Design a protein around this ligand. Structure first.
Ligand code: PMK
Ligand SMILES: *[C@@H]1O[C@H](CO)[C@@H](O[C@@H]2O[C@H](CO)[C@@H](O)[C@H](O)[C@H]2NC(C)=O)[C@H](O)[C@H]1NC(C)=O
Ligand code: CL
Ligand code: CL
Ligand code: CL
Ligand code: CL
Ligand code: CL
Ligand code: CL
Length: 374
């Protein structure tokens, strides 16, 4: 427990044009527990050879997953994202459709960990490193080794440092597992988010947060562990344990989270800048959306492939912003960049003369304008 339902978002990276190669993205989020089945379908057949990020979660602790593959839109062929979850009666198939528009400061670095305990002697585990919303690391479970997803994932650390880190992680895992395997009278899931935010001005902000069955359990605030008020005897127990019984583990954590993490983080940024990519022009295109009702249209404006994140997108009549404009979420793209789509609902007659306007930092001040037409 408890149960949350997956939001499902399907979208293409480029304008859809028959025979021309494209990328199909599927973003599955908001779910809990972590047990899930996601498949990209072509004409009902599951597509093998797809890319998927490792499992992560939000501040809410709900899980999310990115999927994508290469595909070609055609007149005949039908594509879908198929999801199966404990909160679904039947599997949900959401089609991708050109004419529906797809269907549906500070930097931070964190290590994310999910533990799934079905019983005493059976448990799943997985973890991964994330630079902002960008995964930079996986973790091989059998070997107990780090997986560096990119040419810069090492981030200006020597090999000795990272070896020591691997072993530190190994023993940390052995420790907690033994620790959770004790305390036995029972299905449950444990999530850990640990790492650092780096802020303008250089002040690091450390965090180590745990959750249980998707519930806020404990955290680490300024050299002292804190329980989230349940109460909460479990959290208070384990906190108290860490605070005193074995302190010195927290010396490591404290060091690791206030030092090494911001240094590694900065190392990633440095090594990252070499390859790509400072700024990227989006491309934009219009499509219809799902019909809002008889005698009404939904206009969809797609903005895809922009980086950095900040965008301004609006439906216009001349200089007048449209009141009804609805901005979707900013979603991740196949390799690194960003996707967003804005919709508007309008009567048939009032469709003509509406424009979608895009402002991005990389456009050099010359905005993208797209005019609706039939
Ligand atoms: C099966 C799940 C595997 C999960 C491992 C996935 C790891 C996967 C992301 C590899 C990326 C590695 C990445 C390249 C190097 C980043 C270096 C950063 C600065 C280190 C931050 C380490 C975290 C913050 C401290 C952990 C808390 C433990 C030390 C204390 C706990 C109490 O002890 P106890 O338990 O004994 O009682
Ligand atoms: C956790 O629950 C039981 C605990 O033993 C596991 O039971 C095993 O189930 C599979 C297939 O049914 C096999 O490993 C054996 O038949 C069972 N083991 C024993 C010792 O009887 C179970 O598989 C674990 N997790 C599940 C069922 O998801
Ligand atoms: Cl293959
Ligand atoms: Cl289509
Ligand atoms: Cl260090
Ligand atoms: Cl159109
Ligand atoms: Cl960004
Ligand atoms: Cl959306």
């Amino acid at each position: 427990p408890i149960q949350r339902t997956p939001k499902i978002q399907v979208y293409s990276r480029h304008p859809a044009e028959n025979g021309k190669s494209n990328f199909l993205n599927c973003y599955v989020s908001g779910f809990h527990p972590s047990d899930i089945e996601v498949d990209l379908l072509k004409n009902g057949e599951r597509i093998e050879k797809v890319e998927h990020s490792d499992l992560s979660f939000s501040k809410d602790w709900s899980f999310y997953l990115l999927y994508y593959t290469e595909f070609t839109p055609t007149e005949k062929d039908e594509y879908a994202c198929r999801v199966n979850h404990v909160t679904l009666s039947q599997p949900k198939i959401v089609k991708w459709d050109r004419d529906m528009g797809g269907g549906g400061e500070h930097v931070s670095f964190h290590v994310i960990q999910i533990f799934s305990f079905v019983n005493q002697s059976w448990a799943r585990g997985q973890g991964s490193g994330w630079l902002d919303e960008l995964q930079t690391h996986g973790w091989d479970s059998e070997s107990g080794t780090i997986i560096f997803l990119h040419q810069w994932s090492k981030g200006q650390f020597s090999n000795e440092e990272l070896s020591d880190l691997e072993l530190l992680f190994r023993f940390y895992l052995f420790g907690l597992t033994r620790e959770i395997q004790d305390h036995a009278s029972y299905p449950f899931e444990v999530q850990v988010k640990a790492g650092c935010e780096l802020h303008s001005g250089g002040s690091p902000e450390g965090f180590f947060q745990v959750a249980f069955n998707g519930l806020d359990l404990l955290s680490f605030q300024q050299t002292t562990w804190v329980p989230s008020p349940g109460c909460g005897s479990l959290a208070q127990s384990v906190c108290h344990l860490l605070n005193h019984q074995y302190e010195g583990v927290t010396e490591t954590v404290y060091n690791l989270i206030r030092s090494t993490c911001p240094r590694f983080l900065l190392g990633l940024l440095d090594a990252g800048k070499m390859y790509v990519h400072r700024q990227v022009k989006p491309e934009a295109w219009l499509s219809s959306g799902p019909s809002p009702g008889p005698g009404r249209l939904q206009l969809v404006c797609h903005v895809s492939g922009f980086y950095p994140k900040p965008v301004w997108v609006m439906w216009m009549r001349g200089e007048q912003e449209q009141q009804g404009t609805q901005l979707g979420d900013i979603l991740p793209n196949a390799q690194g960049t960003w996707y967003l789509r804005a919709t508007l609902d309008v009567a048939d007659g009032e469709a003509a003369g509406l424009s979608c306007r895009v402002k991005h930092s990389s456009l050099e001040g010359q905005d993208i304008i797209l005019y609706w037409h039939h």
